[PDB]
Design a protein around this ligand. Structure first.
Ligand SMILES: [Pt+2]
Ligand SMILES: [Pt+2]
Ligand SMILES: [Pt+2]
Ligand SMILES: [Pt+2]
Ligand SMILES: [Pt+2]
Length: 211
C-alpha cells in the first residue's frame, strides 16, 4: 500500500511532498476509534477497511525550485487568477483538488511574502484537504458526502497552513505543513492525530475507506 500527498501552486514544483509507507503497525485502525467515530455521527465498513494515513509534515525533499521559476510564481500572483493544488495517490487511485487563491490583494500579498520566505508568513490554504477520503477498486478517489453533509474543494475539508523553514541556506528550503478542522477542532468525529517521535510535530492525517 502506498500514499503520496503533494501540495503546490498549480504550474510549479510542489511546496510539499510526502510519502506514506500508515505508519506503521499491523492493524489498519485502532478499534475504539471506529466506535468513537460511529457514535459521534449520531458506514458499514469494518476495522480492516479503514486506513489511518499519516504524513510527516516536513516535506521529504528540499524545495528544488529555481529562483527564476519562483520569481515567476510570485509575479503571477501580482496580477490575477491562480489556484492552489493538492493531490492524494494510492497506491492507481488519485484525486486532485483545486482551490482558488482569493483575488483579495492584501492576502495575495501575504502569499507572495510567504513564498519569498519572510518570517511570520504562513500560507493558508482553506478548506483544501479532506480528513476523510474513499478509495475504490476502479477510478479516482471519492468523498464520503454523507460524512461531509453532517459536519456542518469542499466545505467540510480541513484547512492547510504552510511555512518555509527560516534561517536555512538557499539550497535548503523546507516547507512545513500543518492541518486543522473547520469549526470545533476537538470534535469527537475527528479521529485524533498523532505527533512524530523524531520532530515532535503533528502528522497530516487522512482516514481512508477502502473497497
Ligand atoms: Pt494487516
Ligand atoms: Pt489490521
Ligand atoms: Pt505581511
Ligand atoms: Pt529543514
Ligand atoms: Pt515549529
Amino acid at each position: 500500500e502506498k500514499v503520496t500527498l503533494r501540495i503546490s501552486i498549480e504550474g510549479y514544483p510542489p511546496l510539499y511532498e510526502m510519502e506514506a509507507q500508515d505508519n506503521a503497525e499491523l492493524g489498519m485502525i485502532k478499534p475504539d476509534q471506529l466506535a468513537s467515530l460511529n457514535q459521534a455521527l449520531t458506514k458499514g465498513y469494518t476495522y480492516e477497511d479503514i486506513l489511518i494515513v499519516r504524513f510527516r509534515p516536513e516535506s521529504e525533499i528540499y524545495w528544488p525550485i529555481s529562483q527564476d521559476s519562483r520569481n515567476a510564481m510570485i509575479d503571477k500572483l501580482s496580477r490575477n487568477t491562480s489556484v492552489n493544488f493538492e493531490v492524494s495517490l494510492e497506491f492507481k487511485h488519485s484525486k486532485s483538488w483545486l482551490v482558488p487563491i482569493s483575488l483579495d490583494m492584501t492576502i495575495r500579498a501575504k502569499i507572495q511574502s510567504a513564498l519569498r520566505g519572510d518570517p511570520g508568513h504562513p500560507i493558508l490554504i482553506p478548506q483544501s484537504i479532506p480528513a476523510f477520503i474513499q478509495v475504490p477498486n476502479q477510478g479516482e478517489l471519492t468523498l464520503p458526502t454523507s460524512i461531509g453533509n453532517t459536519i456542518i474543494a469542499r466545505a467540510w475539508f480541513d484547512s492547510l497552513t504552510l511555512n518555509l523553514e527560516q534561517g536555512k541556506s538557499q539550497n535548503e528550503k523546507m516547507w512545513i505543513a500543518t492541518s486543522e478542522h473547520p469549526g470545533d477542532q476537538n470534535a469527537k468525529l475527528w479521529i485524533k492525530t498523532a505527533n512524530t517521535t523524531y520532530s515532535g510535530r503533528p502528522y497530516l492525517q487522512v482516514v481512508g475507506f477502502i473497497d
